[PDB]
């Protein structure tokens, strides 16, 4: 293009470079020096304009990928790094992921495609992986796809808190409940429940019936999360066994959702025994 004016030929990445114009940076900064001295570029208060010129440099120097070295100290250039470029990285580290996502906090299209490249390499979404990912974007897990979630090792379910599972829709919790039910079947009773408790969004009838027998004490909130379809074919007995003493507050949700349908599907002569004064059903015999 053009040759660099006398003296301006940068022998080191100093502070001076903030004063060079767009075109001066294009010419005067050796590409090979930028790569080896990448550690320093964070500190140097460049403009966005000035960085566009430093991005395009490294693009030339590595037109096939990007050493983890550069990726480490990439600094604020992650934002300018087009998703297309990132789709071809060999990141393969947790500290570099942390590094890149700390500044990402400062959707985000780049963020997504990066994470997908860490797992796509790592092979499975491990516990410690999902631990640090949620430490920046907690609802990550409930952001993924029904299908996508299959790859998750049941071992990884342990890393999940209840926090995560608020943004989670049914068609997701469906894929999530099975895995938890395997991760948490080395437990029983006062142990099993605490853990399994959040996921019961997915849980079907058969699995709820078993819980009753184990004298579990559920609350009305948790109950209101149970699949509508899964509530219908439960006895007045099995309802009062799950809810135990919290059954008292069930009157309130009479005309709500999970229990609305349940009440109607049941005989008046059955409900009466609950001492709640619910109406709707069959007056038989």
């Amino acid at each position: 293009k053009t040759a660099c004016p006398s003296g301006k030929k940068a022998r080191e990445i100093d502070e001076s470079l903030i004063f060079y114009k767009k075109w001066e940076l294009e010419a005067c900064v050796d590409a090979a020096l930028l790569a080896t001295q990448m550690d320093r570029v964070n500190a140097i208060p460049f403009t966005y304009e000035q960085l566009d010129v430093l991005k395009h440099k490294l693009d030339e120097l590595y037109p096939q990928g990007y050493p983890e070295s550069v990726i480490q100290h990439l600094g604020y250039l992650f934002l300018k790094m087009s998703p297309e470029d990132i789709r071809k990285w060999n990141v393969t580290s947790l500290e570099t992921l942390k590094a890149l996502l700390e500044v990402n906090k400062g959707p985000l299209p780049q963020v997504a495609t990066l994470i997908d490249r860490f797992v796509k390499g790592r092979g499975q979404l491990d516990k410690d992986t999902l631990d640090t990912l949620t430490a920046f974007y907690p609802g990550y897990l409930c952001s993924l796809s029904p299908e996508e979630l299959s790859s998750v090792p049941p071992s990884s379910i342990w890393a999940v808190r209840p926090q995560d599972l608020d943004t989670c829709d049914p068609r997701q919790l469906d894929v999530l409940y099975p895995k938890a039910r395997l991760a948490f079947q080395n437990m029983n009773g006062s142990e099993y429940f605490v853990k399994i408790q959040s996921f019961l969004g997915g849980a079907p009838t058969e699995d709820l019936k078993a819980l009753s027998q184990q004298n579990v004490s559920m609350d009305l909130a948790t109950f209101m999360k149970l699949r509508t379809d899964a509530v219908l074919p439960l006895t007045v007995a099995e309802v009062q066994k799950l809810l135990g003493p919290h059954v008292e507050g069930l009157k309130a949700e009479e005309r709500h959702r999970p229990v609305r349908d349940w009440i109607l599907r049941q005989r008046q002569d059955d409900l009466d025994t609950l001492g709640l004064g619910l109406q709707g059903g069959i007056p038989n015999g």
Partner: antibody
Amino acid sequence: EVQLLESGGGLVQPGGSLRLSCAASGLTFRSYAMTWVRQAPGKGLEWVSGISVSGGITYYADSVKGRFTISRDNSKNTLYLQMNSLRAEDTAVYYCAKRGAAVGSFDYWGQGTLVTVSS
Amino acid sequence: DIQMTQSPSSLSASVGDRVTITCRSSQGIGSWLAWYQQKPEKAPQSLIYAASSLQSGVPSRFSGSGSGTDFTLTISNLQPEDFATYYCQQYNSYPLTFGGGTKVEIKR
């Protein structure tokens, strides 16, 4: 409008008889379990008996075992406590209480009727 | 006979205080615990069912917590209408049991 009006409470000679009566009004008496709860003058609270929503199953304190009899009448909106072989120790205010559920807490109490047992 | 026992028996506090009452069953009773207010010459009134749940028409300054064999009625920012006797009751098993009560007095 919810009102539980206990009555029949008076003075009785020891070993005497007496039947109490809680009149319900402003609820579906049919569809609630009630109990009797008594309170010694200047002492604490004590559960005495309890009838289901059926009338079928009846529970009592060992204190009053087979001397008291809880009954109910959904037609007349009434709950009854027969009390025979009354002793000095059974002197108290008797509250008729409405559970918010069978195997639940008493959510409504009556103003409560006083039974004195003396010669 | 499940033994319920409250702490303290008597407690004097001033208005706008956070008062804590204790209840302790001799045996596990999961969450089958209730709290009852009684002001003299009047009937008892329900505050808490299922160890935690507010009854309706009851101020939120009333906060029940606990399970197993340890429970806690906590009256935040006390009012004059709250100076009264408080009773914890188990409905886990017959026979049903209340505690001793806790006479909550005004302080001066």
